[PDB]
């Protein structure tokens, strides 16, 4: 796998993103039964920060959509609730990933996806650190995070969810993956 990505285009991408959010494997996005309008609002809200580095992107391989990722402002997320234990640093960028609902993959799909996302965050969007907050029960994501050098900081409560805060600094990404050449 060698991926490229572009910024999301609501008019063009809405049908696909809505379809992916409806697949049961995407359930941690909590959009299984959503309408097209709901997904349009999700995308437009993700694109509404004043800073253009944030927003959703679509990854491609051989002309076909492969995944969506969001680079988001931690200061407008659950991370920034008082008392979570998150300590904001200038240059922090939050990340979410949504893979397409296709079930036919070559070896190492999600590792190549994550390396692409992380390289984009650091080298295109200027991140100094990537922050994630998956549900503690989402074990698949935890292993994907470990594979690119994330370190767990701890867990924190949100209404109805326990999140696991993990960080990947630009320096740790350099040391652990050779700046995105291999998995940690």
Tell me, what CATH number does 95's domain have? 3.40.630.30
For residue 148, the 8-state DSSP code is T
- Elucidation technique: X-ray
Number of structural domains, the chain?
A: 1
For residue 182, being part of any structural domain is answered with no
For residue 143, being part of any structural domain is answered with yes
Domain of residue 156, residue span: 4-177
Query: What dihedral angle (degrees, nearest 10) is formed by the CA atoms of 52, 125, 141, 167?
Result: -110
Q: No. of H helices and E strands in the chain?
A: 5, 7
Cβ density class 58-68: b for 16+ within 10 Å, e for less: bbebeeebbbb
Cα 122 to Cα 24, 29, 93, 156, 159: the distances in Å are 31, 24, 9, 26, 31
Query: What is the per-residue DSSP string for 67-117?
Result: EEEEEE-GGGSGGGSTTS-----TTEEEEEEEE-S-----TTHHHHHHHHH
CA–CA gap between residue 63 and residue 100 (Å, rounded) = 14
The burial of 179, by beta-carbon neighbours within 10 Å (0-12 exposed, 13-18 middle, 19 or more buried), is given as: middle
Question: How many angstroms separate the first and last alpha carbons of the chain?
Answer: 18
For residue 70, being part of any structural domain is answered with yes
Query: Which residue is it, tokens 């359930």?
Result: 27
What does the block give as tokens for 110? 């999600």
């Amino acid at each position: 796998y060698h991926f490229q990505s572009r910024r999301i285009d609501v008019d063009r991408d809405l049908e696909s993103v809505h379809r992916w959010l409806g697949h049961p494997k995407s359930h941690y996005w909590d959009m299984l039964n959503s309408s097209l309008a709901d997904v349009e609002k999700l995308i437009r809200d993700a694109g509404a920060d004043p800073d253009p580095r944030f927003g959703m992107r679509i990854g491609y391989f051989e002309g076909e959509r492969q995944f969506l990722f969001e680079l988001y402002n931690p200061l407008t997320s659950d991370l920034a609730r008082p008392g979570t234990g998150y300590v904001y640093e200038t240059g922090d960028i939050g990340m979410h990933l949504l893979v397409s609902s296709s079930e036919r993959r070559l070896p190492g799909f999600t590792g190549a996806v994550m390396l692409h996302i992380m390289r984009t965050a650091f080298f295109e969007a200027g991140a100094r650190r990537v922050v994630v907050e998956p549900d503690v029960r989402n074990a698949d994501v935890q292993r994907l995070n470990a594979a690119v050098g994330f370190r767990v900081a701890g867990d924190f409560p949100v209404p109805g969810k326990t999140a696991r805060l993990s960080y990947c600094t630009r320096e740790d990404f350099a040391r652990a993956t050779d700046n995105g050449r291999t998995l940690a």
